[PDB]
Structure formats: C-alpha cells, structure tokens
Write a protein that binds this ligand. Sequence first.
Ligand code: CLA
Ligand code: CLA
Ligand code: CLA
Ligand SMILES: CCCCCCCCCCCCCCCCCC(=O)OC[C@H](CO[C@@H]1O[C@H](CO)[C@H](O)[C@H](O)[C@H]1O)OC(=O)CCCCCCCCCCCCCCCCC
Ligand SMILES: CC1=C[C@H](O)CC(C)(C)[C@H]1/C=C/C(C)=C/C=C/C(C)=C/C=C/C=C(C)/C=C/C=C(C)/C=C/C1=C(C)C[C@H](O)CC1(C)C
Ligand SMILES: CC1=C(/C=C/C(C)=C/C=C/C(C)=C/C=C/C=C(C)/C=C/C=C(C)/C=C/C2=C(C)CCCC2(C)C)C(C)(C)CCC1
Lengths: 50, 231, 50, 48, 222, 37, 34, 60, 67
Amino acid sequence: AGILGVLAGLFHLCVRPPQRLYNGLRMGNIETVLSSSIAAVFWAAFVVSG
Amino acid sequence: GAGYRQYDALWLPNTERPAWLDGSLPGDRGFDPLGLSRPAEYLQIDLDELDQNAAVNKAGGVVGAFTPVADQVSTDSLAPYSEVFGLQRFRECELIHGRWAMLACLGALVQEGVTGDSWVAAQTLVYNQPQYAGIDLPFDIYTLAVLNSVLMGXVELFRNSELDPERRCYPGGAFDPLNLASDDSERTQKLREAEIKHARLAMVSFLGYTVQAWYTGEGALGSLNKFANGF
Amino acid sequence: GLPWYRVHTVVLNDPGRLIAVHLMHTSLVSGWAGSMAFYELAVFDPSDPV
Amino acid sequence: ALLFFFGHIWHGARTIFRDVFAGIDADLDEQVEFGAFLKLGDTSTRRQ
Amino acid sequence: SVWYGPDRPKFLGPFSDGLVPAYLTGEFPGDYGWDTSGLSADPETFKKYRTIEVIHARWAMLGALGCIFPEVLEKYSGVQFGEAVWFKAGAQIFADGGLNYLGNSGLVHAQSIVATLVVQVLLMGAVEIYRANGEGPNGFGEGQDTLYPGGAFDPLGLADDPDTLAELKVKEIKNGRLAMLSMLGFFVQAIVTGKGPLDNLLQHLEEPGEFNFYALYANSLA
Amino acid sequence: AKPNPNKQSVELNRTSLYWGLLLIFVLAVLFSSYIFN
Amino acid sequence: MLTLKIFVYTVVTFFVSLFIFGFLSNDPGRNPGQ
Amino acid sequence: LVDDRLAGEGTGKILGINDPSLFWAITIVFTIVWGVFYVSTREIDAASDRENDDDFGLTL
Amino acid sequence: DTGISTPLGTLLKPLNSEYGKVAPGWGTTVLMGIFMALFAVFLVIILEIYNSSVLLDDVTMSWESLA
Ligand code: CLA
Ligand code: CLA
Ligand code: CLA
Ligand SMILES: CCCCCCCCCCCCCCCCCC(=O)OC[C@H](CO[C@@H]1O[C@H](CO)[C@H](O)[C@H](O)[C@H]1O)OC(=O)CCCCCCCCCCCCCCCCC
Ligand SMILES: CC1=C[C@H](O)CC(C)(C)[C@H]1/C=C/C(C)=C/C=C/C(C)=C/C=C/C=C(C)/C=C/C=C(C)/C=C/C1=C(C)C[C@H](O)CC1(C)C
Ligand SMILES: CC1=C(/C=C/C(C)=C/C=C/C(C)=C/C=C/C=C(C)/C=C/C=C(C)/C=C/C2=C(C)CCCC2(C)C)C(C)(C)CCC1
C-alpha cells in the first residue's frame, strides 16, 4: 500500500483533473474535500469496529 | 555497393513521424504512440465564490482556453521547468535514468563476479556487516546511511543549479576532461546517439534483472547458470 | 449576526487560520494522549499479569 | 461512524447545493411546470 | 602602512637605524632590515631567496603542526597510534600490521614502503613541476603569481583586497619564520633529549627550575 | 497585516436561550437519574 | 554520566562565551545618546 | 563494589576537568565563538562612524 | 497588498500557483473507472474471505492461524 500510495501521489502531482470531473465534484470548493474525508473516516471506523 | 541493400528509419517500416517529433534530437525515432510529448492544451476555471456576505455564491466558470509554453527553466528550486509534459524535461529524465541504469547493470555484474553473492542478497549482507570486496569497512551502518543521504543530496542540489536546458543534459567542463564531444560537429552527434542507445538498452536490461530475480529468485550470473543448466 | 452553529465558517476562505485551527486541534489531541497515558500509569498495578 | 455518516450527507448536500443555501430564486415557476419542457429543468427543449 | 615603507619596524629596535641596507626599502612582507651578511645585494638572488623562504615557511608550518598533532592526540585522547613520536613514526611501515591511520586497521593499512615512495614521487614531482613551470596541465594557472597564485588556491576569497592581502602576507611570513625556528628546536631537542616535543614541554612544566637543558644535558655535551 | 476580512459577530436571541436552557435541563434530568445509578 | 558532563560543559561554555564576546563587541555605544 | 561512579567530588581538579574530552569541548566551543566574533570587529567598530585611534571609546 | 514575504513561502510558492488549470473534456475518467472497478472486486474478495463465503486451501481464517 505504501508503494501504491507513492505511485498515486506522483500521478496526482503530475496530471491535472478533467474539466468535467472538476465541475461535477466542485474541486474549487473545500467542503467537497470535507465530505469525502468524512466518508472515508466513517468507513474506516466501521472497519476497525468490526 | 554489393552484399546489402542501399535502403530516416523509424520504429516501423511504414509509419509517419509525429508532428511534435521533428527528428532533431539525438535518439529521435518518431516513437510516441501515446503522444506524451504533444503540446498540451488546458483550460482556466474562474475562482469559486465563497463569500459569506453574499446572497448567491455560484461556482466558477470557464475563463478561456489556455495552452502553456514548456521547456523553460526558472529559479524555483522546487519546480524549475515550465511544464511537466515537455520534450526537453523528458529527455533529461531519460538521460539520467539511462546513466543510472548503465552504472547499475555494470556494477551488479562486477559485484556478482567478484564477491559471488547475488546483487539482491548483497544489500542485506552489507547492511548486517559493511564491506567491500571482502574488506570490512571502518564505518557503522548508521553513519553510512546518514553520509549517503547527505552526499547524494549535496550532489543533486549541485546538479539542479543549472538553468540552461541544453547544459542540464550535457554539462561539459569538468565532466568532459578529454574534450570528446564538447563542440558542435558531426562527431558529437554520433556520440550522443550511442549514449542514448546504451541508456535505453541498460534500462531494459535492468528491468530484466529485477523481474528475473522476482520470478526465478536468482541474480544475473545466477540466472545465466540456471538457464544453462536446464537443457 | 451569525448563528451559534455557523461560527467556525469564518476560516473557510482563510488558509492561514485553517492551518491554525487544525494545529490547535492536533495540540488538544496530543495533550489528551499524554494526560491519559499519565493517568493510566498512576493507577496501573503491574504486580500480577496472570 | 453513524454520526459521521450523517455529517457526510449534510456536507455533501451543502457543497453541491451551494447557490441555493440562502433560498430559491424569486421566479421559479416556468421551470417547474409539468410537461413544459422535454427535459427536466432544461429551457432549450420546450415542447410537449 | 605599519609594515611597509621607511617607518616599518626593524630587527634591532632603536639600534637598527645604522644597519639597514639601501636595497631593503620595505617593499615585501617580513622586511625587518636584516641583511648583515649581504647575501641579497643582487635583486635576482634576493627574489630567489624570497621564494625559497616562503616555500620553507609553508613547509615548516605544516611540519610543525603534523609533528605535534599525533603526540597530543595520543595522550589527551583515546587514539592509539603505532608510534606517536615524530622521529619514530616512519618505522611503522615495517610493523606486522603495517601503517594504520589513527590506529585503525581499516583506514590506510599501508604495507609496502616502495609503493608509497613511488606514489609520492609521482604526485610530488607532478605538482612541483607545475609550480616551478608556473603552468599546470592544459594551461591551468597561467598568468597567476608563481608564489601567491590565488584563484583555485583561494576558494574562500580571503585575499580579494590588496590591503588585506598585504596584511595576510605579513602574518603568513611571521608565522612561517616562527615555525621554522620551532622545527629547528624540534630537531635539536630530538637529537639531545631523545623524547617527543610534547614530553619535553610537560616535563619542563612539571618543575621548570629542575627539568631544563642546563640542569640535565648541558654538562654531558662536552 | 491588514484587518482580517472574514470578521463576523455571533448572536443568540431570548427564544434560543430558553430552548437551550430547556434542552440542557431536560437532558440533565434524564441522564442524571441514569448516571447516579 | 560522562556524556552528560560533556554535554553540560559544552552548553555552559557556549553561553558564557556568547556573554563575554557580546559584552566585548562595543557595547558602550548602543545607547540613544547624541 | 556494587556499582560504578565518576568519583570526583572533593578532589580539587583544575576547572573540574577530569577528562581531555571536557578540555576539548571547552576549547573548541570557545575557539569557535571567538573566531566568529573576530571577523566582525572591523564592521562593528565602523558603525560609530569613527576610527579606532587612541581617542576611541566612551569617555568623559 | 501582495502579502507577507517569507523564504519558505517563496520556496513553496510554485506548488500553489495553478488554481483552475484543468484538462479539457473527460480527461482520464475511463482509466479511473477501471481502477475503481478493480478496487471494488478486490474489496469483495477480501470481504468474502473474512465472511467465510469463499474458502481457500491455505487460509485457515481462525485463531489457530497464529500457530
Ligand atoms: C446512503 C446513501 C448515500 C447517499 C445518498 C450518498 C450521497 C452522496 N454522496 Mg456519499 N457515500 C456513501 C453513502 C451515501 N452517499 C458511502 C457508503 C460511501 C463510501 C465511504 C460514500 C462516499 C462518498 C464519496 C467518496 C463521495 C460521496 C459524495 C456523495 C454526493 C453525490 C455523489 C454520489 O452520488 O456518490 C455515489 C454514491 C453511492 C452510494 C452510489 C453507488 C452505489 C454502489 C456502488 C452500489 C454498487 C453495488 C455493490 C457493488 C453490489 C455488491 C456488494 C455486495 C458484495 C455486498 C452525495 C452527498 C461525493 C461528493 O460529491 O461529495 C461532496 C463524493 O465525493 N460519497
Ligand atoms: C471532521 C470534522 C468536521 C468538521 C471540520 C466540520 C466542519 C463544519 N461543520 Mg460539520 N459535521 C460533522 C463533522 C465535521 N464538520 C459531523 C460528524 C456532523 C454530524 C453530527 C456534522 C454536522 C454539521 C451540522 C449540522 C452543521 C455543520 C456545520 C459545520 C461548519 C461550522 C461548525 C460550527 O460552527 O460548529 C460550532 C459548534 C458549537 C458552537 C458547539 C457544538 C458542540 C457539540 C454539540 C458537542 C461538543 C463537542 C465536543 C467538545 C467534541 C467532540 C468530540 C469528537 C469525537 C467529535 C464547519 C464547516 C454547520 C454548517 O453547515 O454551517 C454552514 C452546521 O450547521 N456540521
Ligand atoms: C622557538 C621557541 C623555542 C621554544 C619555545 C622552546 C621550548 C623549549 N625548549 Mg627548545 N630549542 C629551540 C627553540 C625553542 N625551544 C632551539 C632553536 C633549540 C636549538 C638551540 C632548542 C633546543 C633545546 C634543548 C637542547 C632543550 C630544549 C628544551 C626546551 C624547554 C625549555 C628548557 C630549556 O632549557 O630551554 C633552553 C633553550 C635553548 C637551549 C635555546 C632556545 C633559543 C630560542 C631561540 C629561544 C626562544 C626564547 C624563549 C621562548 C624565551 C626566552 C627565555 C630564555 C631565552 C631566557 C622548552 C620546552 C629543554 C628540554 O627539553 O628539557 C626538558 C632542552 O633540553 N630546547
Ligand atoms: C577568570 C576569568 C574571568 C573572565 C570573565 C568571566 C565572566 C563570567 C560570567 C558569568 C559566569 C557565571 C557562571 C559560571 C558557570 C561555570 C562555572 C561552574 O559552574 O563551575 C563548576 C565547576 C565544578 O567542577 C566540579 O569539579 C569536581 C572536582 O573538583 C568534579 O569534577 C565535578 O564533576 C565538577 O563539576 O567548578 C569550576 O569549574 C571551578 C571554577 C573556578 C574558577 C576560578 C576563577 C579564578 C579567577 C577569579 C577569582 C574571583 C572569582 C569570584 C569570587 C567571588 C564571587 C562572589
Ligand atoms: C635572515 C638572515 C639574514 C642574514 O643576512 C644572513 C643569515 C643570518 C644567514 C639569515 C638567517 C637565516 C636563518 C636563521 C635561517 C634558518 C632556517 C631554518 C631554521 C629553517 C628550517 C626549516 C624547517 C623545515 C622546512 C621543516 C620541515 C619539516 C617537515 C616537512 C616535517 C615533516 C614530517 C612530519 C610532518 C611528521 C613526520 O612524522 C616526520 C616528517 C616526515 C619529518
Ligand atoms: C505551553 C508549553 C508547554 C506545555 C504544554 C502543556 C502542559 C500542555 C497540556 C495539554 C493538555 C493537558 C491537554 C489536554 C486536553 C484534553 C482534552 C482535549 C480532552 C477532551 C475530552 C473530551 C472532548 C471528552 C468528551 C466526552 C465526555 C465529556 C464524556 C464522554 C463522551 C465524550 C468522550 C465525548 C511545554 C512546556 C511542554 C512546552 C512549551 C509550550
């Protein structure tokens, strides 16, 4: 997972997001980051509880 | 004029050179099926309205089309090049990768011949007990790790200080003591072609090395021996 | 004025103060970890681990 | 985890529906007329 | 300045007015007016003697530091050389373990006297040919002073001002003359006492009125 | 540097104060009965 | 214990040398006098 | 004995130095600070717009 | 009113310079969808392994695998 994370981080450093995805997900807003992070953390909470 | 055929040669017998590859670079074979060096076009999206004092806060629209100019080096120390997808930056990356791969291939072969250990187990053997050609070194592994990090960082920070994109690949000067390809002639072009071909061959060969050790569990000479003693 | 449930939205468009409030949260979490460790050490009885 | 599921739902709704956080437009009757446009909310498909 | 011209200090104090020659006009560093034997009347021989003196000064400074360093590092430290005394440190090349740098069996570990001599001959001959010719490999160091080159030999740029350069020249020549006198002292002390330069200093400091040349060795020298 | 342009003032009216006090005291009743055990 | 002594000696001499060589650096000239 | 200790209390050592390591630490740090201070004295003196002749200093 | 200059801010400035730069069109959405599908398949496989809905020869899936 660390190796894959490094590779994906390099990809996301090099490649710009698509225009359609940018507009759809509102990548210029920070509340979308907040919502996605909250989703990830509650997923992780369910996994660790199980 | 006998014993062969008279016959620019591309990577396919019948194919056309891409527009962005004009054949001026040394190893230019017109090979770019994915078009990674094609001049990229982008778009500019206006800033989102996030004002808390306004009734309506709409998203950002398209300001207009925007195609940047690449292959320009600046004094940034963290992003010197104008764009990631440029031909010159890709050439510099290819040259550095190839030189490292050439050194790696030769060193793995020579170390395997001299010491008798595989190039994979050599890392662990040196980690447990630092050595070189059977001679125990006077340094501790912690000191060696810190020294390697510091020295490599200093060398690469020295290398990054150049600003001319041409001299970023062929610095010359103290790195060409014999003055073999330090002018502008046909003799330097052939040497650059040979260097780029050797770089590509060594890159493919070390990808070999790595995969072969992954699959068969052997090194380079070990893989040769295992292949020979299998018929 | 702002309702009591919208107070922390002032740092939505302020990267510096967003970093500041995140740093404050990290400080509080680390302090809780240290204090909880000390409190558990003050009441632990390692005489019998069986 | 349950409370944060609710939080995710709330914040996603707030970030997508950001322009109508204070209220809907004053005149919003032509777009919400049944069978006025072929496509829902599209004013360029006025038929049927 | 203070160290140049007709008002510079002289080597006899107030008695030096009537002894200074007419060619020692105070133009070069270290000029104190000492030419009683008249060996520098010829300007060419004077220039050659100045070059010889500066080279001797640099070599003597290096030699004094290197003669006193390993002996200090062997008593007031944890280093264990094969031999720390300067006039007995050449015999380490004939030891069973060879010559180990800083007492470490994996630092230099030199074993053959002939190989070190050959390498030294090659390197020192090359550098001294470059210095004498005033012209290094591939035209390196051309047009520079044959005694104060600068440039590649001044990486830190401490001599980029002529006045600072003159003052540093005076400092260098005075330190070098002191080092030359100290190395002569080292030689004669090694001959007479037979102990290291630091041993003599420590023994003198143990009892200055009892452990000196006159109280120990003077009467046995005739 | 210049004053922060994101300055806002909070507010709370008497109805909100009464609702908050009522919520606090009712929760206190219920969970105090359950916590004293 | 000797390592602690060496570290403390280094720190103390560093601070005392700073004090001495700061008070030697033309201190009676850092005043708002005309 | 049962344990080990430095055993230096009430001995009367010069500057408390029972070790060349301590001597080297003191000397190295002092020399470094002095060397850093030495090169700046010409610049510091020039901040008063006066030469360091026999009349220099704060006088009354 | 440009801001407050700082050596570290100047060092990190190029990393925060392209706000709205986007790739025109759909970009690399299909590749990301392929990766998403592979991730979903992997998650299903591991969930079924834990749930004991799939049985593997060498996987004990019990406390006895600590032996
Ligand atoms: C309970 C219903 C639910 C609802 C209504 C929403 C609603 C929303 N989500 Mg959230 N979300 C949920 C659960 C939910 N989510 C879960 C469980 C996760 C996983 C952690 C997420 C993670 C998530 C992310 C990462 C993002 C959102 C965002 C969004 C917004 C729109 C985008 C969206 O449609 O995503 C699609 C949501 C789906 C749940 C539909 C997919 C249906 C799945 C793939 C079913 C496929 C079936 C399955 C493979 C069958 C076999 C399984 C079997 C072996 C058990 C909106 C607020 C997006 C956003 O705009 O945020 C600002 C975004 O960034 N969500
Ligand atoms: C990951 C962290 C996180 C973050 C950074 C935010 C951030 C934000 N939230 Mg969201 N939210 C989250 C998770 C998060 N939320 C979750 C899990 C939920 C579901 C419960 C919500 C539900 C939610 C609502 C319903 C609202 C927001 C709103 C807001 C904004 C203002 C909040 C406010 O000012 O409160 C100020 C809070 C108080 C004055 C006191 C609250 C005290 C609570 C009741 C208990 C005391 C808490 C305790 C000390 C610490 C908690 C422990 C920890 C384990 C959680 C801000 C952008 C507001 C909005 O959208 O603004 C436009 C809003 O209306 N959020
Ligand atoms: C350059 C400075 C210098 C310094 C600091 C020293 C320092 C030392 N010498 Mg050495 N010495 C030197 C040069 C120097 N010497 C020279 C040039 C020679 C050859 C003539 C000698 C030959 C020598 C011998 C034969 C002996 C010493 C010994 C000693 C110790 C003093 C006891 C003694 O009887 O001295 C007497 C000194 C000499 C015979 C000549 C010194 C002449 C120089 C030019 C004087 C430097 C002046 C001095 C620092 C201050 C004035 C004091 C004095 C002149 C009244 C002391 C560690 C003694 C020792 O090791 O005992 C344990 C001892 O046995 N030295
Ligand atoms: C003398 C030059 C002065 C130059 C200028 C000095 C400026 C000073 C600035 C202020 C510094 C104050 C803090 C100093 C801390 C370091 C010292 C320390 O802790 O040492 C503590 C150490 C203790 O050393 C101990 O020794 C033991 C064995 O004896 C063991 O080895 C212990 O392990 C070891 O710690 O003591 C010394 O180093 C001795 C110092 C002796 C100083 C003599 C000075 C002589 C000249 C001055 C005479 C007058 C002095 C004043 C008298 C009247 C006072 C009212
Ligand atoms: C001035 C005048 C004037 C008038 O007119 C006249 C007259 C008088 C003549 C004059 C005078 C003169 C003089 C005095 C001189 C002197 C000199 C000297 C002493 C030198 C030395 C000189 C000296 C010197 C160089 C020295 C050197 C040294 C060295 C290198 C060393 C080395 C080494 C070492 C490190 C260590 C090891 O282990 C060993 C060895 C190897 C050994
Ligand atoms: C200044 C400083 C310092 C100090 C510091 C300190 C001392 C700190 C502390 C800190 C701390 C000491 C902190 C703490 C914190 C805590 C917290 C933050 C907590 C929280 C909690 C909570 C939030 C809870 C909740 C709850 C409840 C109430 C009940 C049940 C449920 C729950 C769980 C929800 C020093 C000198 C070092 C260094 C320099 C600076």
